[PDB]
Enzyme design. Structure first.
Site, PDB file in Angstrom:
ATOM      1  N   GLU B 364       0.832  -1.205   0.000  1.00 46.19           N
ATOM      2  CA  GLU B 364       0.000   0.000   0.000  1.00 46.19           C
ATOM      3  C   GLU B 364       0.877   1.269   0.000  1.00 46.19           C
ATOM      4  OE1 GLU B 364      -0.313   2.572   2.437  1.00 46.19           O
ATOM      5  OE2 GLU B 364      -2.319   3.341   1.963  1.00 46.19           O
ATOM      6  N   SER B 568     -26.079  26.092 -17.558  1.00 42.81           N
ATOM      7  CA  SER B 568     -27.177  25.977 -16.571  1.00 42.81           C
ATOM      8  C   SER B 568     -26.979  24.716 -15.708  1.00 42.81           C
ATOM      9  CB  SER B 568     -28.495  25.836 -17.293  1.00 42.81           C
ATOM     10  OG  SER B 568     -29.610  25.688 -16.394  1.00 42.81           O
ATOM     11  N   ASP B 606     -30.414  -6.862  -4.740  1.00 42.61           N
ATOM     12  CA  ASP B 606     -29.593  -6.498  -5.925  1.00 42.61           C
ATOM     13  C   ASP B 606     -29.666  -5.011  -6.177  1.00 42.61           C
ATOM     14  OD1 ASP B 606     -28.735  -9.105  -6.268  1.00 42.61           O
ATOM     15  OD2 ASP B 606     -29.798  -9.404  -8.218  1.00 42.61           O
ATOM     16  N   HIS B 629     -15.939   7.355 -10.379  1.00 42.03           N
ATOM     17  CA  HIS B 629     -17.161   7.655  -9.595  1.00 42.03           C
ATOM     18  C   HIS B 629     -17.532   9.083  -9.847  1.00 42.03           C
ATOM     19  CE1 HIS B 629     -20.027   7.778  -6.401  1.00 42.03           C
ATOM     20  NE2 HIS B 629     -19.752   6.539  -6.010  1.00 42.03           N
TER      21      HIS B 629
END
Ligand SMILES: *[C@@H]1O[C@H](CO)[C@@H](O[C@@H]2O[C@H](CO)[C@@H](O)[C@H](O)[C@H]2NC(C)=O)[C@H](O)[C@H]1NC(C)=O
Ligand SMILES: *[C@@H]1O[C@H](CO)[C@@H](O[C@@H]2O[C@H](CO)[C@@H](O)[C@H](O)[C@H]2NC(C)=O)[C@H](O)[C@H]1NC(C)=O
Ligand SMILES: *[C@@H]1O[C@H](CO)[C@@H](O)[C@H](O)[C@H]1NC(C)=O
Ligand SMILES: *[C@@H]1O[C@H](CO)[C@@H](O)[C@H](O)[C@H]1NC(C)=O
Ligand SMILES: *[C@@H]1O[C@H](CO)[C@@H](O)[C@H](O)[C@H]1NC(C)=O
Ligand SMILES: *[C@@H]1O[C@H](CO)[C@@H](O)[C@H](O)[C@H]1NC(C)=O
Ligand SMILES: *[C@H]1O[C@H](CO)[C@@H](O)[C@H](O)[C@H]1NC(C)=O
Ligand SMILES: *[C@H]1O[C@H](CO)[C@@H](O)[C@H](O)[C@H]1NC(C)=O
Ligand SMILES: [Ca+2]
Ligand SMILES: [Ca+2]
Ligand SMILES: [Cl-]
Ligand SMILES: [Cl-]
Ligand SMILES: [Zn+2]
Ligand SMILES: [Zn+2]
Ligand SMILES: [Zn+2]
Ligand SMILES: [Zn+2]
EC number: 3.4.17.21
Lengths: 689, 689
Positions: B364, B568, B606, B629
C-alpha cells in the site's frame, strides 16, 4: 407446450398483411411517416395485450438532401462547359416524398479534378495505387464500386489517400444476379437506381454529437464540426448507367488483373484522367444538410411473474431509406406477428418467468442511433439484468436457407428450436427447419451441425453485444452463398424494395418469413421462460480454442519476428485451457442444482447471464472507446463483418509495413496479454469458490 | 445476539499482543520480513477457523535506496567545496535493515542550483511565485514543507514549474504538537527524523507498469520510462534540523504573509539564492532504484451459507515504512482480532448469510499496489457481487474521538452500531461510542447526529470505491480538530512509529483501538448477515441535494459567464429531484417486501447492492481513466481529500485564467450534463418497472 402454441399461432398471411400495411409509403427516420408508423405499432402492441408500449425519443444528428440545392456529379470540358450531369416504382407514381439518392453525412462541397477508379476503395486498393503504381490521389476525385467493406470505410480510406471526393456506384458484377431481369420484371437492380446509405465511421458511438450518453434535451453536444465519424469529403452514389458514362474514357494504366474489372462495357482502366474523348474533368456538387432531429423508439414490455428484474430484448428497426420492404420492414412485420402471438398466450393466462422488452428502433439507417441511444440511457439496468438480445431486422434477404449469427452461448438453443419448427423449403414438407438448414449449409467445423456465424456489426444488436456484453442473436433467410456470389441483394437500399418485390420474387407464400418469425419468437420464449437460462458455456470454450488457433496460425508468417521481439501466445493458450476446465466444471455443477431452491437457481443463472459480460473491457479497443468485447469486437476494414481477438488482429495487421517494428510488436504483446487476462477473468466468474 | 457475541469477544489485551508481535522488526513491502508477516497472518487465520487463507502474489514496480550510493543534499561554495551535507529508536539498536529516509519513485539525479522556498508547493504557491512575484523556478531546486496536499502533487507541481529537484521537509508548524516533548520522552517529531513516502501521481492506476490489468507473470508491462505517475525530477525528504540549515540564509523577498512562515528560527524568505553567508548553491544526490519485486496479499474467506456469491470485504494493508506501529500495524492487529472473533462464532456453529473476504494487502505504501492489483484481477466477480468494503488501516491516529468516512449508503448503519459499542473515552464509562462521538464531533448539517466525512482517497478502499463503485467505509480514532491543528500525527512515516509510542502516549489501555475493532467487525457482520442489506438510499438523496447546492454556490462568482456561455445547472437539480423521489419510493416498497420470498428479497438486495455501481462511468474523468465515480472521485490537488462532483469542480477550477473561455465553459457544460445523466440513471435502477 406453450412454445408450440406460440409458434403455431403465428401465420404467414398475418406477416403478409402487416408487411403490406407498412410499405405503402416511405418511412425515413425523422420524418412524419415514420412517427405515424411508430404510433401504429404502439396501438397494435396495446391491442395485443402488452403491459406497456411507450414512445421514447431522442434528438440526434440526421442528414438529408437540400430540396432546393440538388446533388449531382458532372463532367466538364476544358472550357468549363457541362458535357454530362446526373439526374418511382410502378404503382407508386403518386408518392411524393421519396428522398433522392444520397449518402447521409457526406461533407458539403463542389470539388473538381481528375477521376481515378479505385475498385472497392479498400485499404489494399489504395496501397496498390500508391505503393505499387506510384499514383497520387491528392487531390483527385475517386470512383469506387460498392461491396466488400462498409461504405463508410471506403470514404475514410479515400480521405486518407488525399482524395477530394468519392463517387460510389453499384457495379452489376456485384449487384446484378445472373439471368434475372431488372425490376419490375425480375428482382434485379436497374441501371437507373442508386444505393442510399450513411457514410459515418462511428465505431459504435451512436449519435455523433453525444458519444457515451443519451441524447436528451439537456444533454451536452459536441460541436457539429467535431461530430464523431463525420467524413470530411463529399460522397454521393450513382447507378451503373451513370457510372458507365464516367468510367468509359478513363485512361492511364490498364486494370491490373480481373479482380479490378467489373461487368460494364468499359475498360476498367484506372486513370487518372480521360483519354479518347469533351470529357476533361469531373465535378461533384453535394449539399446535404445535417440537422438535429427528433427520433422515436417504441418500447413495450411483458413483465416477468418470477424474475421481473431480468430481461430478454426483442428489438428491430423500422426506419427505411424508401419503402424498405426487405430492410427493415420484413422484420417489422415479423416483430408484430411475434408480439401478437405472445399476446394470445397472455389471453389464456400465461405470463413469462422473466420480463420481455419489445423495441421498435428508429434511425438505424443513420448509424444505429435509436437502439444505441436507448442502450446509453438504460445501460445501468441493462448491463446488470439482461439475459439476451434477439434482433428483428430484415427477415428475407434470399430464399435458399436460414442464416444464424449469434454468440456461442446460444448455439445449442438455436439447434434445439430449429428442430421443432417446420421447414418452409420446397421438398422439405415433412421435415424441420434444422434438417433443411443442415442439408443446405453444414458447418465447416462439424459436418453434422449447421453453420452458425459470429456476430459482427451493422444492425441494432451492436451496442448490446459489443459495448454492453449482452448475449445476442440474429436469424434470417438468405441466399445460397456457394452459387449466389452477388453482395447483399440486388435492390438493397434502393427505391425498388417494394412489397411487390418480396411477394413476387422472394417468398410468395410468406412461409419463409413465417419460419424466421417462429424462430426469433421461440428464442425469446425459451430465454425468458426457462427456469435455467439455456446457454452452453462449453460451446464458448470450444469457440475460444478455435479462435486462439486461428490468430496463432496468422502469426506463423512472422515467426522470426515473434522470436526476435519476445512475443509469445503461451498466456492466451493457457487462459483458453483454464476457461475450458472452468466451463466443464460449471456444467457438471449446473446439472446438480436443486431446481426447488430459488437462490441456488438464481446464483447459477447469474453466472450464465454475466459470462458474456466478463469479455467487456471498459478501456475499449485502441481508438475505439465503444467497442469493448475483447473476443468479438469488429472488423476495422468492414463493419458488417465480425473479427475475433480484434485487439490482436489489428495489432498484427500490415505489421511488416509499420515504420517502427519494436513499437509495433510491443502492441501485439499488449493485446495478447489483455486477451489472456480477459479469458482468465471470465473463467473465474464460473468458479464455485 | 450474535453481533453482541462478536463485539464482546474482542479484547484490548489481544490487540495489544498482536501489535507488539508485529512491530519488533521493519516490514517494508517486498522485503523478507513482510513476507514472513504474511505467512504468520495466514497461519493465524487458519487457526481461527477461516475456510481459506491463501497468498496471492503480483510482481510490481517498487523503489528503494541504493545501499552503495546513499542519497543526500549538500550546500557548496563558489569553489565547489562541500560546506554542509545531510547524514534507531531506543530498544531497537540491534535492528539492521531500517530503510533510510527517501521518497519512493523519485527520479535519479544530481541537480545543482539556487534554492527557492515554495511553502507547500501547491498550485497556488507556484501561481503566487510566478504570476505575482515574477520568480522563475526554471531551473532552481525548491524546498517545500510537507502538508495540505499529497506529497506526489507537490512534486508534480514543482515539475510543472521548471524546478529541477524538490526537497521535502517536516516543519514543526505542521508536525510538532504544542507543549509535548519529542520522542522518546513524548510523542512529538524530533528534528532528526524525516517522513518517508511515495511520490507517484497514479490517480488510482495501481502498479505503474500495468494500468488496468493485474501484474501476473505473463502480463504486458510498459517500459519503465513510461510508468504511470513516475516523477521526472529528484525528490528527497529531510528533517527540520537539516531544513533549518538550508532555509537560514535564503535571501530575496520576505515571506509574503504569516501563511508562508513556519516555526523554525529562520526568516522564511523565498530566495532564490542565499545572502549573508560560504553558502552558494544547493545540490541534490538521489539514486534510488526502481525494480520489479514480488508482493503478497493474504486473502481468506468465510463462505456464505445462503448467498455465497455475495461478498463483504474486510481489507487492510500490512506493509510499513519502518515498524509502522500506527500506520498500518495498529489496523493489522485489529484485523487479526476481528478474524479471531468471527472464528469464535464459527466454533459454536454460526456461518454468515453472505461470504466474508478477509484481505491483508501488500505494498500500500508504494501506491495502493496490492489492493489495486487484486481488484484488477478479480474485477468481474467483485463488481457483480460485492456488497461493501470495510478498510482496516491505522486504527489510532489520535485519542480524542471516532472519525468515520463512508458512502452515504452506510450512515444509518454506522449510527446504529456505534450506539451498541461501549465508549472507550474517560468520563463516558456508562455510555456508548455514539454518545461520546456525538458530543465530541457533531455534524454541521445536523447537530443531533455525529459528523461522517466523505470517502476520498489514499488507502486501500480507493480502487473498490472510486473505480468499481463498491460501497466503502472506514473508521479510526483521531485527534480533536478544533484544538489540534497539526497534520496527520507527528511521527507519521518516520522511524518513531513504535509499539512504545502507541502504548505510552496514544492508548495505554488499548480500549480505543478495541472500540475501532468492534465497529469495523460489527459493520462487516451486519452487512454480511442481514437478510436485507442495511443501506439507506434516502441518505444518498440528501447528500446529493447538499452536493448540488455546493457546486452551484461555487458557480455564483461566475454568474455573468454562466449566462453569457449558456451554462445551466437545471438538469443537475432536476436529476437530484428525480433521484430523491425514486429513493423515497424505493424505501416505501422495501418495507413491504415479503421476507419469506427469497427471490423478492434477492431482487431488492440487488438494487441496494448495485446502486453505488450506477455512479461509475467507464469513460472515467478527464485524464484519469481509473477515477470513475461521478459523485465522489478525488481531489486533483490533494489525493487524501475527497471532492464532490469532481468533473464539474475540475472544469470550473481557476477558470478565469484559462486561455480560451469559450472552450473552458463548454467543458463545464459537458460535466454538468454527465452528472445529471448519471444521477438520473442511478434513480432508474431503483424503479419498480
Ligand atoms: C491457468 O491456470 C494455471 C494454473 O493455475 C496458471 O498456471 C500458473 O502459471 C504461472 C505462470 O504464469 C506459474 O507461476 C504457476 O506455477 C502456474 N501454476 C500451475 C499449477 O501450472 C496459469 O497462469 C493460468 N493462466 C492464466 C493466463 O492466468
Ligand atoms: C426528471 O424527471 C422529469 C419527469 O420525467 C423529466 O422532465 C422532463 O423534462 C424534459 C426536458 O428535459 C421535458 O421535455 C419533459 O416535459 C419533462 N417532463 C415533465 C413531466 O416534467 C426530467 O428530464 C428528468 N431529469 C433528468 C435529468 O432526466
Ligand atoms: C438549401 O440550399 C439553398 C441554396 O443553396 C440555401 O440558400 C439554403 O440555405 C439551404 N438550406 C439549408 C438548411 O442550408
Ligand atoms: C426464390 O426461389 C425461386 C424458386 O427456387 C428462385 O427461382 C428465385 O430466384 C428465388 N428468388 C430470389 C430473390 O432469390
Ligand atoms: C548502486 O550504485 C552503485 C554506485 O553508483 C552502482 O554501481 C550500482 O549499479 C547501483 N545499483 C543499481 C541496481 O543500480
Ligand atoms: C492521549 O490522551 C491523553 C489524555 O487526555 C493526552 O494527554 C495526550 O495528549 C493524548 N495523546 C495524543 C497522542 O494525543
Ligand atoms: C501526392 O502525394 C505527395 C505525398 O503525399 C504530395 O506531396 C503531393 O502533393 C501529391 N500530389 C499532388 C499532385 O499534389
Ligand atoms: C523562466 O521562465 C521563462 C518562461 O518559462 C523561460 O523562458 C526562462 O528560461 C526561465 N528562466 C531561466 C533563468 O532560464
Ligand atoms: Ca449518445
Ligand atoms: Ca495493474
Ligand atoms: Cl436480424
Ligand atoms: Cl482505515
Ligand atoms: Zn436493416
Ligand atoms: Zn439498411
Ligand atoms: Zn496506512
Ligand atoms: Zn502510510
Amino acid at each position: 407446450s406453450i412454445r408450440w402454441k406460440l409458434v403455431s399461432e403465428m401465420k404467414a398471411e398475418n406477416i403478409k398483411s402487416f408487411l403490406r400495411s407498412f410499405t405503402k409509403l416511405p418511412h425515413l427516420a425523422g420524418t412524419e411517416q415514420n412517427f405515424l408508423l411508430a404510433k401504429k405499432i404502439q396501438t397494435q402492441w396495446k391491442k395485443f395485450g402488452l403491459d406497456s408500449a411507450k414512445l421514447v425519443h431522442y434528438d440526434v444528428l440526421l442528414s438529408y438532401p437540400n430540396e432546393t440545392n440538388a446533388n449531382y456529379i458532372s463532367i466538364v470540358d476544358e472550357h468549363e462547359t457541362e458535357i454530362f450531369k446526373t439526374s418511382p416504382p410502378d404503382g407508386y407514381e403518386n408518392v411524393t416524398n421519396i428522398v433522392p439518392p444520397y449518402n447521409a453525412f457526406s461533407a458539403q462541397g463542389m470539388p473538381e479534378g481528375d477521376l481515378v477508379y479505385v475498385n472497392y476503395a479498400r485499404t489494399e486498393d489504395f496501397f496498390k495505387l500508391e505503393r505499387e503504381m506510384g499514383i497520387n490521389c491528392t487531390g483527385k476525385i475517386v470512383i469506387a464500386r460498392y461491396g466488400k467493406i462498409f461504405r463508410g470505410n471506403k470514404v475514410k480510406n479515400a480521405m486518407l489517400a488525399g482524395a477530394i471526393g468519392i463517387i460510389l456506384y453499384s457495379d452489376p458484377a456485384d449487384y446484378f444476379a445472373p439471368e434475372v431481369q431488372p425490376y419490375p420484371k425480375g428482382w434485379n437492380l436497374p441501371g437507373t437506381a442508386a444505393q442510399r446509405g450513411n457514410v459515418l465511421n462511428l465505431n459504435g458511438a451512436g449519435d455523433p454529437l453525444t458519444p457515451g450518453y443519451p441524447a436528451k434535451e439537456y444533454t451536452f453536444r459536441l460541436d457539429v464540426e467535431e461530430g464523431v465519424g463525420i467524413p470530411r469529403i463529399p460522397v454521393h452514389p450513382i447507378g451503373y448507367n451513370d457510372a458507365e458514362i464516367l468510367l468509359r474514357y478513363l485512361g492511364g494504366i490498364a486494370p491490373p488483373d480481373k479482380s479490378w474489372k467489373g461487368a460494364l462495357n468499359v475498360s476498367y482502366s484506372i486513370g487518372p484522367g480521360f483519354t479518347g474523348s469533351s470529357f476533361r474533368k469531373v465535378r461533384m456538387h453535394v449539399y446535404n444538410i445535417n440537422k438535429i432531429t427528433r427520433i422515436y423508439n417504441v418500447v413495450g414490455t411483458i413483465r416477468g411473474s418470477v424474475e421481473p428484474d431480468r430481461y430478454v430484448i426483442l428489438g428491430g428497426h423500422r426506419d427505411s431509406w424508401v419503402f424498405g420492404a426487405i430492410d427493415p420492414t420484413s422484420g417489422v412485420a415479423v416483430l408484430q406477428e411475434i408480439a401478437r402471438s405472445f399476446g394470445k398466450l397472455m389471453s389464456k393466462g400465461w405470463r413469462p418467468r422473466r420480463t420481455i422488452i419489445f423495441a421498435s428502433w428508429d434511425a438505424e439507417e443513420f448509424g444505429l442511433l435509436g437502439s444505441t441511444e436507448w442502450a446509453e440511457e438504460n445501460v445501468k439496468i441493462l448491463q446488470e439484468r439482461s439475459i439476451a438480445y434477439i434482433n428483428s431486422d430484415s427477415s428475407i434477404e434470399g430464399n435458399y436457407t436460414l442464416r444464424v449469427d449469434c454468440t456461442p452461448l446460444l448455439y445449442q438453443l438455436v439447434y434445439k428450436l430449429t428442430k421443432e419448427i417446420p421447414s418452409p423449403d420446397d421438398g422439405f414438407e415433412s421435415k424441420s427447419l434444422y434438417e433443411s438448414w443442415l442439408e443446405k449449409d453444414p458447418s465447416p467445423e462439424n459436418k453434422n451441425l449447421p453453420r452458425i456465424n459470429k456476430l459482427g456489426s451493422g444492425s441494432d444488436f451492436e451496442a448490446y453485444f459489443q459495448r454492453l456484453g449482452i448475449a445476442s442473436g440474429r436469424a434470417r433467410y438468405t441466399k445460397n452463398k456457394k452459387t449466389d456470389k452477388y453482395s447483399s441483394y440486388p435492390v438493397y437500399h434502393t427505391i425498388y424494395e417494394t412489397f411487390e418485390l418480396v411477394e413476387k420474387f422472394y417468398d410468395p407464400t410468406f412461409k419463409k418469413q413465417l419460419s424466421v418469425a417462429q424462430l426469433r419468437g421461440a428464442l425469446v420464449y425459451e430465454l425468458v421462460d426457462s427456469k435455467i437460462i439455456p446457454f452452453n458455456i462449453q460451446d464458448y470454450a470450444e469457440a475460444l480454442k478455435n479462435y486462439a488457433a486461428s490468430i496463432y496460425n496468422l502469426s506463423k508468417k512472422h515467426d522470426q519476428q515473434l522470436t526476435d521481439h519476445g512475443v509469445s501466445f503461451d498466456s492466451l493458450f493457457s487462459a483458453v485451457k483454464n476457461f475450458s476446465e472452468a466451463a466443464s466444471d460449471f456444467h457438471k455443477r449446473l446439472i446438480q442444482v436443486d431446481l426447488n431452491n430459488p437462490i441456488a437457481v438464481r446464483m447459477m443463472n447469474d453466472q450464465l447471464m454475466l459470462l458474456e459480460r466478463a469479455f467487456i473491457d471498459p478501456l475499449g479497443l485502441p481508438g475505439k472507446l465503444f467497442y469493448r468485447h475483447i473476443i468479438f469486437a469488429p472488423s476495422s476494414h468492414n463493419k458488417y463483418a465480425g473479427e475475433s481477438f480484434p485487439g490482436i488482429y489489428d495489432a498484427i495487421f500490415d505489421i511488416e509495413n509499420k515504420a517502427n517494428s519494436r513499437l509495433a510488436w510491443k502492441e501485439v504483446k499488449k493485446h495478447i496479454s489483455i486477451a489472456a487476462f480477459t479469458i482468465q477473468a471470465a473463467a473465474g466468474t464460473l468458479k464455485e469458490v
